[PDB]
Design a protein around this ligand. Structure first.
Ligand SMILES: [Ca+2]
Ligand SMILES: [Ca+2]
Ligand SMILES: [Ca+2]
Length: 295
DNA sequence: GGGTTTCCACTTATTCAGGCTTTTAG
DNA sequence: CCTAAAAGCCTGAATAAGTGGAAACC
């Protein structure tokens, strides 16, 4: 249908994408293992069009259901990985995921030489997989008895432009209408809240948003050993002047675009002070009920 | 063909999106 | 007093990452 700006796409990839490298026990392979290399995105059913638009932009990839409520785009046809590579050389990732892309490239090169059909190419792929995403299973690591490093170098890069940021925010942002039980006349303060969420491994990136957007602050949270960061803007002046124009100018994708649009309607109400009238409050309550999970 | 690649159904792990209420600033 | 802003709390699930099975292809 519609095609996606290449930096918007990279941003969305930084947010939602995943590189994959399968090294599979296989009785029929001359070396006892077969491989599969690729890139994939899994979204809620409601955002299938993003997947289809990505498929259209690159002209690669297979779309399929992923359980009852999700759908995926997977690219594993080896020739088509050349497209993935060319895209991310001209429009590179900036989160720690770049590290996974660099490993995907190393694995691509081994397979391009057909070395994965030989002991030494398989061994090499196990060394690559060992640093990729969640690394080797215990079964695979006991099968290749050699000291295999699990570390790679931290990525540290800057937001390259607003188009990447709109792609990334299309993945990781949220636009909240926070209805606060307040001591004022109407009894409800209306608070617009923009947030961007992301694992701590990319702290430097999340801290940069403060200066990159000239507003906001960051909260840290965890569930047991699992920590992440939350970039939040709540000052209406920053919302209206700094957040909203960025994304009016750099268009979000997916149903999150509708949420931002509803959020902007509420912004206009606030700017006109109608959030201080019972009838404006009613409309704002009705916008909220129908955005995000209520859509 | 016998190996190898590709696709499809489905699962598992966790990092997100994004819900609240109460307190302070101005 | 009054409204805006920030402090401060939370977890279900949409993501991330992955696996089993087998058809299709070279
Ligand atoms: Ca992400
Ligand atoms: Ca998302
Ligand atoms: Ca499961």
């Amino acid at each position: 249908r519609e095609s996606i700006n290449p930096w918007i796409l990279t941003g969305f990839a930084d947010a939602e994408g995943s590189f994959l490298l399968r090294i599979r026990n296989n009785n029929k392979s001359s070396v006892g293992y077969s491989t599969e290399l690729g890139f994939q995105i899994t979204l809620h059913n409601k955002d299938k069009s993003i997947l289809e638009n990505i498929q259209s932009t690159w002209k690669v990839g297979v779309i399929a259901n992923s359980g009852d409520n999700a759908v995926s785009l997977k690219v594993t046809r080896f020739e088509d990985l050349k497209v993935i590579i060319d895209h991310f050389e001209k429009y590179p990732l900036i989160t720690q995921k770049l590290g996974d892309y660099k490993l995907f490239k190393q694995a691509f090169s081994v397979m391009e030489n057909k070395e994965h059909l030989k002991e030494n190419g398989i061994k090499e792929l196990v060394r690559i997989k060992a640093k990729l995403n969640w690394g080797l299973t215990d079964e695979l690591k006991k099968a290749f008895p050699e000291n295999i490093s699990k570390e790679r170098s931290l990525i540290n890069k800057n937001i390259p432009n607003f188009k990447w940021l709109a792609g990334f925010t299309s993945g990781e942002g949220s636009f909240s209408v926070n209805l606060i039980k307040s001591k004022s006349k109407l009894g409800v303060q209306v608070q617009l809240m923009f947030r961007i969420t992301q694992h701590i491994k990319d702290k430097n990136l999340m801290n940069s948003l403060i200066t990159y957007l000239g507003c906001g602050y960051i909260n840290e949270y965890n569930k047991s050993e699992f920590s992440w960061l939350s970039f939040r803007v709540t000052k209406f002046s920053d919302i209206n002047d700094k957040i909203i124009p960025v994304f009016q100018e750099n268009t979000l994708i997916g149903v999150k675009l509708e949420d931002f649009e509803d959020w902007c309607k509420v912004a206009k109400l606030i700017e006109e002070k109608k959030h201080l009238t019972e009838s404006g409050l009613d409309e704002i309550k009705k916008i909220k009920l129908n955005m995000n999970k209520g859509r």
